[PDB]
Scaffold this active site. Structure first.
Site, PDB file in Angstrom:
ATOM      1  N   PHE A 195       0.594  -1.042   0.115  1.00  0.00           N
ATOM      2  CA  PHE A 195      -0.427  -0.050   0.224  1.00  0.00           C
ATOM      3  C   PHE A 195       0.797   1.119  -0.125  1.00  0.00           C
ATOM      4  CE2 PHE A 195      -3.548   2.495   2.145  1.00  0.00           C
ATOM      5  CZ  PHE A 195      -3.436   3.863   1.856  1.00  0.00           C
ATOM      6  N   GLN A 235       3.936   6.355   5.176  1.00  0.00           N
ATOM      7  CA  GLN A 235       3.574   7.760   5.112  1.00  0.00           C
ATOM      8  C   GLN A 235       4.751   8.232   6.450  1.00  0.00           C
ATOM      9  OE1 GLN A 235      -0.705   8.604   5.739  1.00  0.00           O
ATOM     10  NE2 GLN A 235      -0.654   9.890   7.084  1.00  0.00           N
ATOM     11  N   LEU A 283      -7.104   7.465  -4.747  1.00  0.00           N
ATOM     12  CA  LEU A 283      -6.525   8.666  -3.787  1.00  0.00           C
ATOM     13  C   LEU A 283      -7.054   9.598  -5.934  1.00  0.00           C
ATOM     14  CD1 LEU A 283      -4.268   7.382  -1.515  1.00  0.00           C
ATOM     15  CD2 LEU A 283      -6.840   7.627  -0.810  1.00  0.00           C
TER      16      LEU A 283
END
Ligand SMILES: Nc1cncnc1Cl
Ligand SMILES: Nc1cncnc1Cl
Length: 165
Positions: free
Chosen positions: A60, A63, A122
């Site tokens: 994924f 971050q 996104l």
């Protein structure tokens, strides 16, 4: 004129891992690129050096960039606490994309993520502003320390960062 390049030297529980470099699309998203560049050099007096990748989900994204609260709830931009979504010209096309994290429309600060998969859902929600240039192998190594819920098994830090060229 030439898009800027920045680097992050990554460490794992303080041990050097390698360097990731990024091309910043200043040609397309100048305001957002400039924020990331400045936070990487630390020229405003604050920025990424010493911060962590607090959430890493394999398959994924990785971050980071929360240098005020260290956990995903903080960060600030060079323009103020938050700034607007500049544009959505660029898309989340696959691994290596660099994009701004946010908490709603027009809430960009300093947190960002590196995609490790195509994240097309996104598109039009998160501003894409750069891509990994060198060191995708290092990203993949980082990713190994993540988990389904995003908590890391070792502390993944930006030991040093700055601008190249
Ligand atoms: N809320 C706000 C105020 N001024 C500039 N940018 C933003 Cl996102
Ligand atoms: N600033 C912030 C707060 N909560 C979630 N995401 C972000 Cl980017």
């Amino acid at each position: 004129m030439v898009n800027p390049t920045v680097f992050f030297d990554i460490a794992v529980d303080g041990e050097p891992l390698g360097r990731v470099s990024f091309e910043l699309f200043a040609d397309k998203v100048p305001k957002t690129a400039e924020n990331f560049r400045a936070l990487s050099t630390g020229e405003k007096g604050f920025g990424y050096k010493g911060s962590c990748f607090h959430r890493i989900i394999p398959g994924f994204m990785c971050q980071g960039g929360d240098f005020t609260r260290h956990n995903g709830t903080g960060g600030k931009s060079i323009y103020g606490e938050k700034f607007e979504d500049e544009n959505f010209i660029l898309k989340h096309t696959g691994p290596g994309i660099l994009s701004m994290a946010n908490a709603g429309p027009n809430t960009n600060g300093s947190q960002f993520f590196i995609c490790t998969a195509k994240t097309e859902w996104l598109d039009g929600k998160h501003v894409v502003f750069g891509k990994v240039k060198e060191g995708m192998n290092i990203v993949e190594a980082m990713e190994r320390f993540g988990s389904r819920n995003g908590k890391t098994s070792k502390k993944i830090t930006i030991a040093d960062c700055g601008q190249l060229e």
